Amino acid sequence: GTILIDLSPDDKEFQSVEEEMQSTVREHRDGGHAGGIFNRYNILKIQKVCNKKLWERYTHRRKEVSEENHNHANERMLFHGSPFVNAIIHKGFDERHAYIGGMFGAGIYFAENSSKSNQYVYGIGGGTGCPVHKDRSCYICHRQLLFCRVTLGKSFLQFSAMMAHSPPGHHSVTGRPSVNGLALAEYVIYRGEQAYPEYLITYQIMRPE
Ligand SMILES: [Zn+2]
């Protein structure tokens, strides 16, 4: 049911998505261990993900959440990194895309920092890095992130020192770093239908000069 529509680098939509990727890179406290060493990306392709059934699943849950939260879906655009991008874009988010051992519970994780999501592209903590070179900082191999539409509803605020159910009365969790004042938030959802993978971004990390 999924088709992928290539966006032109001249299209304003491509440019707004690239800008959100590039502008939300930060330094990581592991010195690049998980995601590699880089300050910016080479964006190779941005594709719009189109799937009527997955979209309608998303908008149906969005209306439910909105009705439970003073008519406010609290919808965001957020990054998601995973070796299972190919299955997500075809079949949607589900429990197999849950990070069972994450800090904010067994759910599906999203990030404001593209570079946080990049740490998960090859597995938890970057796994063993790219398939070809076993390099977590591979500058050659192509990586993929999703830039997703996510319904947060009433989000439980969990300050952090950096499938389950939402905390009662809530629709998501906000993991808000309280020590590193330049790290942006992460969010966790517990129903796959509260996210739609809008864009598939193909990229390489770039070796700093
Ligand atoms: Zn590689």
UniProtKB/Swiss-Prot annotation:
Superkingdom of source: Eukaryota
Residues involved in Zn(2+) binding: C130, H133, C138, C141
PTM comment: Ubiquitinated at 'Lys-48' and 'Lys-63' by RNF146 when auto-poly-ADP-ribosylated; this leads to degradation. Deubiquitinated by USP25; leading to stabilization. ADP-ribosylated (-auto). Poly-ADP-ribosylated protein is recognized by RNF146, followed by ubiquitination.
Compartments, as annotated in UniProt: Cytoplasm; Golgi apparatus membrane; Nucleus; Chromosome, Telomere
Occurrences of domain PARP catalytic (ranges): 8-209
Tissue: Highly expressed in placenta, skeletal muscle, liver, brain, kidney, heart, thymus, spinal cord, lung, peripheral blood leukocytes, pancreas, lymph nodes, spleen, prostate, testis, ovary, small intestine, colon, mammary gland, breast and breast carcinoma, and in common-type meningioma. Highly expressed in fetal liver, heart and brain.
Function field: Poly-ADP-ribosyltransferase involved in various processes such as Wnt signaling pathway, telomere length and vesicle trafficking. Acts as an activator of the Wnt signaling pathway by mediating poly-ADP-ribosylation of AXIN1 and AXIN2, 2 key components of the beta-catenin destruction complex: poly-ADP-ribosylated target proteins are recognized by RNF146, which mediates their ubiquitination and subsequent degradation. Also mediates poly-ADP-ribosylation of BLZF1 and CASC3, followed by recruitment of RNF146 and subsequent ubiquitination.
Subunit architecture: Oligomerizes and associates with TNKS. Interacts with the cytoplasmic domain of LNPEP/Otase in SLC2A4/GLUT4-vesicles. Binds to the N-terminus of Grb14 and TRF1 with its ankyrin repeat region. Interacts with HIF1AN. Interacts with RNF146; this interaction leads to ubiquitination and proteasomal degradation. Interacts with NUMA1.
Record family assignment: Belongs to the ARTD/PARP family.
Protein name (database record): Poly [ADP-ribose] polymerase tankyrase-2
Organism of this sequence: Homo sapiens (Human)
Taxonomic lineage of the native organism: Eukaryota, Metazoa, Chordata, Craniata, Vertebrata
